[PDB]
Design a binder for this molecule. Structure first.
Ligand SMILES: C=C(c1ccccc1)[C@@]12CC[C@H](NS(N)(=O)=O)[C@@H]1CC(CCCCCC)=C2c1ccccc1
Lengths: 237, 11
C-alpha cells in the first residue's frame, strides 16, 4: 500500500502538462516579441528561470511548507532551489528520456550532439554525471511516489540553519524518510537496496547542483547571463 | 532576495 503521508505529498504535485505548456507559452512570447535581429545557453537560462517560478509555487502551496513563516520558507528554498532544478531535470529524463537526447521542461526534445557542441566542458561534464544518475534511477524503476518523497527530502533539508521552526523541518525529514522506507518495502520487496540507492542520489544531486550554481555564477560574473531574473537572484543570495 | 519573498507573498 501507499502511506497516507505519501498520498498527501502527491496531492501537492502540479499537473505536469499544465506547467510544461505554461513555460512553453512563456518562452514562445519571449522570442516572438524579439526582432529578427539578435543564444541557446541563454534560452536555457530562461527555461530554468521559469521552471524556478513553478518550483516556488509548488512548495508555497505544499503541505507542511505552507505552515512555515516566509523567513523560513526563503531559507529552505534558498538552500535547495538548484537541487530541485536538477532533480526535476533528472526525473524528466527517467520518464521521457531517450538515448542521445535531452527532454526540456517545455516538452521539446534536443539531440545531445547539439547541446554538447555549445554547453562547454564544465556543463557537459555536469550533464553527463546527471545522465549517470538517470541510468541508475531508471534501472531502479524510480517512480513518481519516490520522486515526490525525494523532492520533500531535498526541500526540508537538515542543512538549513537559523530556522525559527527547525523542529517542523526535522519532523518532515523524518516522516518522509520513514514513509519512503515503507513504500519501497511493500511495492519493491525484492529490491532490498532500492531505498539506500535512492538516498545515495541526494548527495550526488546536491554536488551537481552546487557545482552548477558555482559555474552559472561564474558565467554571470563573466557577463554571459540574461540579467536580474529570478535565476540570478537566487545565485546572489 | 526581494523577488523570492514576492513569489511567496503575492496573492
Ligand atoms: C541548471 C540548468 C541550467 C541553467 C542555466 C543555463 C543552462 C542550464 C539545467 C537544469 C535543468 C534545466 N532544463 S530546462 N532547459 O528544461 O529548463 C537546465 C538545462 C539543463 C540541461 C541542458 C544544459 C545545456 C546548456 C547549453 C540543465 C542541467 C545542468 C547541469 C546538469 C544537469 C542539467
Amino acid at each position: 500500500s501507499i502511506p497516507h503521508l505519501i498520498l498527501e505529498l502527491l496531492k501537492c504535485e502540479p499537473d505536469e502538462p499544465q506547467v510544461q505548456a505554461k513555460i512553453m507559452a512563456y518562452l514562445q512570447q519571449e522570442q516572438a516579441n524579439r526582432s529578427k535581429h539578435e543564444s541557446t545557453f541563454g534560452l536555457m537560462c530562461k527555461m530554468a528561470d521559469q521552471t524556478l517560478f513553478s518550483i516556488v509555487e509548488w512548495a508555497r502551496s505544499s503541505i507542511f511548507f505552507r505552515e512555515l513563516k516566509v523567513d523560513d520558507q526563503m531559507k529552505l528554498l534558498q538552500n535547495c532551489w538548484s537541487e530541485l532544478l536538477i532533480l526535476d531535470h533528472i526525473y524528466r529524463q527517467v520518464v521521457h528520456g531517450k538515448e542521445g537526447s535531452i527532454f526540456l521542461v517545455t516538452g521539446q526534445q534536443v539531440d545531445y550532439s547539439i547541446i554538447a557542441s555549445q554547453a562547454g566542458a564544465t556543463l557537459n561534464n555536469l550533464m553527463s554525471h546527471a545522465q549517470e544518475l538517470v541510468a541508475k534511477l531508471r534501472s531502479l524503476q524510480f517512480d513518481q511516489r519516490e520522486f515526490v518523497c525525494l523532492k520533500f527530502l531535498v526541500l526540508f533539508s537538515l542543512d538549513v540553519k537559523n530556522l525559527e521552526n527547525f523542529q517542523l523541518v526535522e519532523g518532515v525529514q523524518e516522516q518522509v524518510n520513514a514513509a519512503l522506507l515503507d513504500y519501497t518495502m511493500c511495492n519493491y520487496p525484492q529490491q532490498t537496496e532500492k531505498f539506500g540507492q535512492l538516498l545515495l542520489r541526494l548527495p550526488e544531486i546536491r554536488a551537481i547542483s552546487m557545482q552548477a550554481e558555482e559555474y552559472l555564477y561564474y558565467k554571470h560574473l563573466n557577463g554571459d547571463v540574461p540579467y536580474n531574473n529570478l535565476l540570478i537572484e537566487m545565485l546572489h543570495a | 532576495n526581494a523577488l523570492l519573498r514576492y513569489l511567496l507573498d503575492k496573492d
